[PDB]
């Protein structure tokens, strides 16, 4: 909890804005592992790994939309 | 505006891996692109359609 780079989680993120999503996996740099969005306006949103739509988003992109 | 991806490589475990970002197909790039930086710190370019890389990702979001 010393260099996170999410204050907090947000949802409703929809794969169609999504440019970039990226997950930064839990360690000494921050106690929770955190996935960040980068959209296609350049803005970015801090997602929460455990939460059901964000896996989802991810399998989409992976296989998908 | 184009892939980021001149190649892909196998081999690298979700133990090995220190971020993960994937980048969904478009008109910059015809096919997803997963990039994952090791905790080595050089990057590796993973196939998107590989079981193997979907796994490891879903693995990364649960804590694994």
Redesign the interface.
């Not at 999504?18 to 360690?27: D, E, K, N, T, Y």
């Given at each position: 909890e010393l260099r996170c780079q999410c204050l907090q989680t947000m949802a409703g993120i929809h794969?169609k804005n999504?440019?970039?999503?990226?997950?930064?996996?839990?360690?000494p740099h921050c106690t929770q592992?955190e996935?960040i969005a980068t959209l296609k306006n350049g803005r970015e949103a801090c997602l929460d790994?455990?939460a059901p739509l964000?896996?989802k988003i991810?399998?989409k992109?992976?296989?998908g939309?």
């Open positions: 794969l999504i440019q970039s999503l990226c997950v930064l996996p839990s360690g592992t996935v790994p455990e964000v896996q991810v399998q992109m992976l296989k939309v």
